[PDB]
């Protein structure tokens with residue numbers, strides 16, 4: 001019973017709901033100062049124990065689901081979203097069976113095919129912009145990412161079936177507490193047409209899937225990985241299971257990729273020098289005529305890579321990873337009891353003053369010298385770390401770098417009247433005047 005420091009509260013049940021909810025990052029920064037790397041506090045009935053800093057976060061990253069449980073906090077968040085027999089509604093071994101099926105289909109051989117497809121979808125979409133004007137970038141990315149992701153993981157049959165009609169039918173699907181995401185100004189009807197997309201979208205897949213079943217167009221696309229995929233008991237995945245796995249893979253990468261793409265642009269629309277140094281790198285690595293991209297070139301676009309890593313450092317779309325303690329855990333000379341909701345914050349760890357120089361500046365060149373991203377284990381964890389890591393990370397870098405390149409080539413970006421959008425935790429539904437960006441064609 002040697003429990004970590006616990007921040008007390010004068011408000012019985014809500015605890016620190018207001019203080020924390022007002023600014024979670026500032027709250028936790030202050031808590032690390034006052035209380036150390038492992039602190040507890042009550043919020044709306046639950047005791048939360050945060051692991052702050054790399055050395056404390058090591059507990060969760062090196063943990064097993066039998067001790068720190070995701071299916072005890074992340075299951076009824078996701079199950080109404082992804083479906084039955086898929087995601088956190090199945091036993092971990094068969095859960096991890098499908099995850100190993102997904103990770104096989106997300107390989108370099110496919111990433112080489114994916115880079116062309118992403119550019120075509122970007123070129124036909126961003127033509128809507130025309131010559132010059134101003135767009136809502138968060139909304140712009142939301143729509144583009146759906147198309148790009150759909151035309152890579154779902155196939156061409158399902159892309160053919162896709163129209164501007166269904167793009168927001170994912171929004172009601174997205175609605176269904178859902179994950180500690182960074183708040184953003186994406187289209188937020190959330191309700192849209194609940195219960196209706198579940199029929200529309202699911203049957204969109206059944207039909208497309210049957211075209212691949214009774215036919216001999218066995219191709220190398222992600223869907224053909226799942227149709228031919230067999231469990232380790234021989235039985236292959238059913239019709240509804242394959243659809244659930246594909247729907248869920250586009251949703252887990254939607255807001256994440258969209259929010260990051262937008263923030264990086266805003267960060268580059270603020271610093272015009274870096275936006276030029278990037279364009280230099282583009283025509284210098286690919287040639288001045290800007291020929292179509294391919295996987296290989298992406299690996300040497302290092303400035304873009306360091307801008308993306310710096311974006312993910314300051315604006316990680318997953319704000320907090322959470323687990324429920326089923327067995328007592330030991331960290332920093334403390335024992336976390338059964339029933340605590342153990343939390344790691346990539347945002348905090350990637351901002352901690354005792355680990356990052358110029359913590360709040362968007363400085364991509366910090367990776368050219370020493371930094372915590374390589375010099376520490378769990379100080380830079382946008383995609384997670386260790387045993388708990390994003391399987392879409394490889395597709396993410398490919399998708400994001402291809403998209404941003406296709407943008408920085410065909411456009412230049414700047415802030416409208418100098419407006420740089422800020423995240424507000426105090427505005428429940430009343431966002432401050434929406435985020436807009438300025439675009440103008442190149443040359």
Ligand code: HEM
Nearest residue numbers: 249252253256257260318321382383384388390391392396
């Ligand atoms: C900037 C982009 C992204 C970030 C920062 C991100 C972040 C994360 C993180 C931190 C996790 C671990 C959550 C946890 O263990 O509690 C995760 C899991 C996952 N992500 Fe992402 N992700 C991104 C993009 C994507 C993409 C593009 C896909 C799919 C194409 C995707 C699919 C998944 C899936 C399937 C999981 C599995 C959840 C599990 O392990 O049980 N994500 N992501």
